[PDB]
Design an enzyme around this catalytic site. Structure first.
Site, short mmCIF file in Angstrom:
data_model
loop_
_atom_site.label_atom_id
_atom_site.label_comp_id
_atom_site.label_asym_id
_atom_site.label_seq_id
_atom_site.Cartn_x
_atom_site.Cartn_y
_atom_site.Cartn_z
N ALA A 112 4.36 1.42 0.42
CA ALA A 112 5.77 1.13 0.27
C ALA A 112 6.04 0.39 -1.04
CB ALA A 112 6.22 0.28 1.43
N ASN A 166 0.76 -1.17 0.00
CA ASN A 166 0.00 0.00 0.00
C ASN A 166 0.82 1.25 0.00
OD1 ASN A 166 -2.77 -1.27 2.00
ND2 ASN A 166 -2.34 -1.40 -0.27
N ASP A 216 3.87 -11.88 16.02
CA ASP A 216 4.56 -13.18 16.01
C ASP A 216 5.60 -13.29 14.91
OD1 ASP A 216 1.85 -14.28 14.41
OD2 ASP A 216 1.29 -13.74 16.56
#
EC number: 2.7.11.1
Length: 309
Positions: free
Chosen positions: A18, A16, A128
């Protein structure tokens, strides 16, 4: 098409906000990855966040985490010039090439565990370890990228994902890592995932039961190591430091025992690299400030790039 000292070559990812371009550094000829980020369209919170990642990238100095080399920045745009892992994600690799013998599996697990441990020493990880975080470079070395990062500036629930995440509870640390780390090893050494099924309801049923069979070639050390990672109750799981000590981890390293990573003293005086930079036009004062004050400018980026690949 250039930015700063970089010739831009193919695009390797849009997201989006980058865009990651592969590129070549025209002073030293190193290949690098350049994350181009529009900052014109960013609400203050995206900007705060952008700049936090940047700070973290700035201090991650590890042979198995992607290095940051230079920041080139205008009012409008942020370029982050960073290490390029040409080799893809580790899960893909396994899916594409099958299991690894224990010896290669160890070398890779060593690099992984040490990089993950080290991140923790260095910032606070809030999400995570993810498959897209585990890359390989041209020489099959691990490089972790963006561990614990939002994916705003990136470019159901995974087979490689703690059983308690399927309970809805947020990421709480080196605890969830350990499970993930266990799935990595299982796959590294066996080629296949330890848990699966047709859909969300087979996968979850499977994972939360947490039974798996090992393949007959897996060594007992390896199976034993796995018995410390793939363990259902998160509090019975080895810590990262405790993992580092496991027997399987140290086969062939009985002198060099795996240990939490400590950054070496930085070498800012490599005379070879300095002589090259003086020949290039840079001044010795210039080199040194750039280095001691960690500016991530054209000069510091040159000295780092002269040191690799």
């Amino acid at each position: 098409p250039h930015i700063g000292n970089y010739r831009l070559q193919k695009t390797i990812g849009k997201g989006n906000f980058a865009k990651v371009k592969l590129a070549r550094h025209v002073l030293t000829g190193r290949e690098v990855a350049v994350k181009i980020i529009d900052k014109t369209q960013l609400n203050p919170t995206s900007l705060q966040k952008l700049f936090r990642e940047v700070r973290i990238m700035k201090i991650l100095n590890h042979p198995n985490i992607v290095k940051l080399f230079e920041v080139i920045e205008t009012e409008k745009t942020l370029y982050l010039v960073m290490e390029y892992a040409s080799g893809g994600e580790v899960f893909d690799y396994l899916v594409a090439h099958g299991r690894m013998k224990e010896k290669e599996a160890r070398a890779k697990f060593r690099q992984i565990v040490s990089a993950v441990q080290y991140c923790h020493q260095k910032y606070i990880v809030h999400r995570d370890l993810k498959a897209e975080n585990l890359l390989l470079d041209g020489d099959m070395n691990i490089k972790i990228a963006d561990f614990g990062f939002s994916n705003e500036f990136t470019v159901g629930s995974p087979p490689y994902a703690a059983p308690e995440l399927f309970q809805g509870k947020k990421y709480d640390g080196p605890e969830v890592d350990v499970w993930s780390l266990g799935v990595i090893l299982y796959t590294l050494v066996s080629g296949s995932l330890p848990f699966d099924g047709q859909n969300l309801k087979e996968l979850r049923e499977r994972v939360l039961r947490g039974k798996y069979r090992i393949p007959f070639y897996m060594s007992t050390d390896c199976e034993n190591l796995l018995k410390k990672l793939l363990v259902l109750n998160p509090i019975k799981r080895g810590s990262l430091e405790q993992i580092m000590k496991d027997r399987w981890m140290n086969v062939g390293h009985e002198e060099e025992e795996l240990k939490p990573y400590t950054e070496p003293d930085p070498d800012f005086n490599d005379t070879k690299r300095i002589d090259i930079m003086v020949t290039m036009g840079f001044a010795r004062d210039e080199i040194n400030d750039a280095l001691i004050n960690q500016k991530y400018d054209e000069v510091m980026a040159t000295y780092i790039l002269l040191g690799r690949k």
